[model samples]
Target chain A: PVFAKAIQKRVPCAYDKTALALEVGDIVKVTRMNINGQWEGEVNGRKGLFPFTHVKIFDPQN
Target chain B: PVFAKAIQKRVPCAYDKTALALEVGDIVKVTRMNINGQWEGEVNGRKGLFPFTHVKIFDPQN
Candidate 1:
């Protein structure tokens, strides 16, 4: 599984709908990134898409 | 229904996964926004979330 760690906190989005409300030091399952768009992933069973700038991939597969 | 229009072009997310590959002037169904993260919506039956900066809502229930 693609894994990552939260490097920054993404406050609960506008309505807390889809983007996972993240806290620093949390581990996430990295799904995708945009080099521009946000990042998609799951944290503590909550799946949400937020900024990749807030995460640090555990294994970048590069 | 909460409707909106695409204001910019989202050059598809990494791997072309959950984000709708949107073109300019496309109509979308607004679900949520971040003022930070991104926007979630449906365009022609495709459900995906991208930057809200790319959308112009028709009528937000607010």
Candidate 2:
């Protein structure tokens, strides 16, 4: 699993049940990626789609 | 030059200078289409990228 941290405040939309309002430096658990440049993830136990460009990922294996 | 109305409350991502937060049934002025699934429109004088799936256009000529 990959984890990501928001570099800026991202106001995410409600497409799935996980609607998250992310602030700067908030960490999220990246779940899946969509072909349309959208990523689904869990932030503070909430799930929603955030733009791929908004977050910087942290891969523990790397 | 086309017009659209938000069918759902869309929380737009700020890629350009036109950052907008739209609600359901709110009308917007469609400006441009990007290569991605993102659409740029002006809502209440604010502009931003919103998902294509969230809006339907009002083609007055059709």
Candidate 3:
């Protein structure tokens, strides 16, 4: 599976319960991609949605 | 909120439990998006993931 690396710090928006809070260098395993430019992913065994534009999508080498 | 209009008919692949089966002209109200190019949407009161590339993203007249 592909992963996403947070490129910038992020916090959930107001009225958000599903969006993930992220910091730079955080790693998220991509689970699904949204047409609205959001992504559902798992981090530290928890899953939440994040903005696709906030992360770098890549295949981990290791 | 924005909507997605199916550009072509689609059926979930084997082992798919979340992907939405779509028909041409089907309208989906986007609920959430994944990083894997998939989007979770509601169609006819049911929610499922669908490939974003298979639909046209747009703002409809309401």
Candidate 4:
């Protein structure tokens, strides 16, 4: 089940420089369940790079 | 400046025929900027066969 408020918190971010890169409209999840933690971003059209401890990237199509 | 004249031809690839299987520390990217394609794979501790045009399967220890 989902709701309208769920989509508002999600956004797209571009990477400046890293081993991987992300693109717009890519769906990423937050690995860290606590406060002030980082997000591991992953999308269908790109790779990801945030931080292991902060966030972990994944391909939902897998 | 980002010199170095590039590297040994740079043989990196975007997605492959193996669906969208990314590990906990895996990386990925896109190539078909104009034309779009689909993928199929299994992940997230769950094993099964997916379908074409499907993305978002792998999970980060979820």
Among all candidates shown, the one with the greatest lDDT: 3
Q: How far off is residue B38 in model 3, in Å?
A: 0.6
Q: Each model's number of backbone clashes? A: 1, 5, 8, 7
**DockQ for each candidate?**
0.02, 0.04, 0.02, 0.02
lDDT of 1 by residue, B1-62 (tens): 11122222222223536555566667667666662576666657766657665556654342
Q: After superposition, how far is residue B17 of candidate 4 from its true place, in Å?
A: 42
lDDT of 4 by residue, A1-62 (tens): 10011111211222255333333333444322324442333334444344334222443555
User: Rank order by TM-score, top first?
Assistant: 3, 2, 1, 4
lDDT of 3 by residue, B7-49 (tens): 2222222245665666656777777777488766666876676
Model 1 chain B: lowest-lDDT 10 consecutive positions: B1-10
Task: Please list all clashing residue pairs in model 3, or write none if there are none.
Answer: A32-B34, A32-B35, A33-B34, A33-B35, A33-B36, A33-B38, A34-B33, A34-B34
Q: Which scores greater on TM-score, model 2 or model 4?
A: 2
Superposed model 3: Cα runs more than 4 Å off: A1-62, B1-13
Q: Which residue pairs in candidate 1 have backbone atoms (N, alpha carbon, C) closer than 3 angstroms, thus clashing?
A: A20-A48
lDDT of 3 by residue, A1-62 (tens): 21122222221222456766665566667778879777677556766776666666663553
Stretches off by above 4 angstroms in model 4 are A1-20, A45-62, B1-62
Candidate RMSDs in order: 20.0, 17.5, 20.7, 20.7
CAPRI verdict on model 4? incorrect
